[PDB]
Every structure is written in structure tokens, then in C-alpha cells.
């Protein structure tokens, strides 16, 4: 899956696509036709990406309590370290709170994981880039 086009972020945990809802909250849905799961990633520098929702223009961000929200402007809380583990899953670590290892994660219920509650031994932080349609 070349980087260019918008893509889906599929969480290994419950099989949910990362979703940024119109009211600014972040969760996960199994519905592949949902219009809030199409994400365009971009980068200002090697290994650090911005994750933006094509539908509503909001960027993914992580606040100081480890909470995921959709932001209207790309600020320092919108910068995620993208790691490709040869395990072939991607992980997204908040750049602002990299020291504490705060991971983008989705629980089995489709609700967001908070920074503090994540760590490397979980399926909640493992994502797989998927094309918008058929694959």
C-alpha cells in the first residue's frame, strides 16, 4: 500500500478502523463504509507523520492526559512517531509524550485507549494500513 492515497487504520484488537468523528472525538468502527475513517497521512520529517481525516479536515491529536481528540490545526499534539515493526504492524507513538510511550490504541469495544493505559504488550496498539476499498 503505497503511501499516497488516503487509507484505513485497522486495529488488530477488535478489527476496528480508527475514526475521527465530526464532534472531535476518536473511536473505532467496524463499518468500512463510514466516511470518518478515511485518513490521509503526511510528513514534515522522516518517521513522524500527521494523520488527517479527509472527511472533516481534523488531525489526530493526543492531549496531556493521553486522550485522543480530533484537532482543527496541526500542532505539536498532532505529531505521531510512525514505527513499522517487521511483525508487519504499525504503531503510533505521540511525539509530545514519547518519553512515556503513549500509544494510539483501540480497545476491543471500539473505544479509544488512553496513553497511560497502553504499553508494548498489547494488541490495542497494532494497526494495519488498508486501502479504502476492495484491497
Amino acid at each position: 500500500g503505497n503511501y499516497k492515497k488516503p487509507k484505513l487504520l485497522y486495529c488488530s484488537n477488535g478489527g476496528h478502523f480508527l475514526r475521527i468523528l465530526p464532534d472531535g472525538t476518536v473511536d473505532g468502527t467496524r463499518d468500512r463504509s463510514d466516511q470518518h475513517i478515511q485518513l490521509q497521512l503526511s510528513a514534515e520529517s522522516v518517521g513522524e507523520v500527521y494523520i488527517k481525516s479527509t472527511e472533516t479536515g481534523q488531525y489526530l491529536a493526543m492531549d496531556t492526559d493521553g486522550l485522543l481528540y480530533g484537532s482543527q490545526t496541526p500542532n505539536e499534539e498532532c505529531l505521531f512517531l510512525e514505527r513499522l515493526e517487521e511483525n508487519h504492524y504499525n504503531t503510533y507513538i505521540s511525539k509530545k509524550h514519547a518519553e512515556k510511550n503513549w500509544f494510539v490504541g483501540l480497545k476491543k469495544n471500539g473505544s479509544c485507549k488512553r496513553g497511560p493505559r497502553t504499553h508494548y504488550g498489547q494488541k490495542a496498539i497494532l494497526f494495519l494500513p488498508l486501502p479504502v476499498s476492495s484491497d
Binding site: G1, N2, Y3, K4, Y10, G14, G15, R30, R32, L41, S42, A43, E44, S45, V46, G47, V49, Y50, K52, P74, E82, R83, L84, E86, N87, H88, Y89, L128, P129, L130, D135
Partner: protein
């Protein structure tokens, strides 16, 4: 104690709502259809709507009609598709279909399309273009540089938070000057490594 006769039913719906199973190649996959019913329902698997035999894939597969599951290890692209569990007894037949998505990843430095950018020639005052096309799994950061003033490199254009693909793909040099002659490079870096391709600009007089 003993309960009544009837057509089959799902006993656990929580381990079955995950319909799309997307895993990297070589991983094992397990689809569940935990059923109940009396008489004891029989379970059967179809692959893209057809009878799924053991010899249909290398290494076969393990069916545990004790666990009401289908396990395929070492998943490969030829396994992609829909898997349907047909569970039945004398009074009915229920069913569910999972979708198997096998992903292939390429942990590599960015691959620049062969021959781009291409060298260019122009009379002073004309216009030229340089093209760069990149292939990358990890999100890459692409930019156009010039090997100059002889200290080395000058950044002509760079990808940012919201720059379009179109914008960084082509480097336009308008009104070419003799100073503009020289080496043009498309630089692409990802978390695995960096790649670059160079093009020379020949400026002529007239």
C-alpha cells in the same frame, strides 16, 4: 439439565462480531461460529461460497467442531476471501461469513521510479521540469534539492503537513538562467532509510 430440540443458534456473539480479519502474511487465522442446538448441529465451511477441502491450500487447515472454529496458519494471498460457516441440524441451518484480508508489507527505503528525475536541456530563458515518483510503505518525507555554490545543498521545495502529491512530484524551473544549470535531486526518506535520484540541467545560450 437437558434442554429442548430446535434449530441451531449462536451461543457466543461476542467472539464473532469481528467480521473482517486482516492480518499480515504468514500469520495464523481463526474464525469462530460457536453454536448450540439439539440435536447437536453439524458445522461446515465454504471458501468464497464453495466447498473448502484440505488440499485447497498448502498445509491444509484445522477444524475443531468442538470449538466451532476454522484455523488456517501461514496465511498467504491465495487465501484472501469470504469464509462461511454453515451450522445445522434437522430443524434448521444458520450461518456467518468472515472476510479474510491478507496484507503484504514492504519494510524498505523509498523506491524512486527508474529514470526520474530525467536530465533536461534548455536555452537560457526557457522552462524545464523535473519529475519524481516515489513508492513507500512507511510515510515518506520528500524534497527537492540542488547541489550548489562551489557548501553543498539547497532546498528548492519540500513536502509538509498539507502539500499535495501533485506539488512535490514535479519541480518546475521557470526562466532558466545559467545559475540554474547543475544537479537536481529528489530526496525521499522514511523510517527505514533514504533514497535519491539526480538529474543534470544543461543550460545553453541563444
Amino acid at each position: 439439565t437437558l434442554e429442548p430440540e430446535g434449530a441451531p443458534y449462536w451461543t457466543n456473539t461476542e467472539k464473532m462480531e469481528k467480521r473482517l480479519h486482516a492480518v499480515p502474511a504468514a500469520n495464523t487465522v481463526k474464525f469462530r461460529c460457536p453454536a448450540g442446538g439439539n440435536p447437536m448441529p453439524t458445522m461446515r465451511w465454504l471458501k468464497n461460497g464453495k466447498e473448502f477441502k484440505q488440499e485447497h491450500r498448502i498445509g491444509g487447515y484445522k477444524v475443531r467442531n468442538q470449538h466451532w472454529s476454522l484455523i488456517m496458519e501461514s496465511v498467504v494471498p491465495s487465501d484472501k476471501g469470504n469464509y462461511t460457516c454453515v451450522v445445522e441440524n434437522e430443524y434448521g441451518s444458520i450461518n456467518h461469513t468472515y472476510h479474510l484480508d491478507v496484507v503484504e508489507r514492504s519494510p524498505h527505503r523509498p523506491i524512486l521510479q527508474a529514470g526520474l528525475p530525467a536530465n533536461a536541456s534548455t536555452v537560457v530563458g526557457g522552462d524545464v521540469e523535473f519529475v519524481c515518483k516515489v513508492y513507500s510503505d512507511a510515510q515518506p518525507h520528500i524534497q527537492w534539492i540542488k547541489h550548489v555554490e562551489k557548501p553543498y545543498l539547497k532546498v528548492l521545495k519540500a513536502a509538509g503537513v498539507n502539500t499535495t502529491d501533485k506539488e512535490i512530484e514535479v519541480l518546475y524551473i521557470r526562466n532558466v538562467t545559467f545559475e540554474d544549470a547543475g544537479e537536481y535531486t529528489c530526496l525521499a526518506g522514511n523510517s527505514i532509510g533514504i533514497s535519491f535520484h539526480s538529474a543534470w540541467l544543461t543550460v545553453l545560450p541563444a
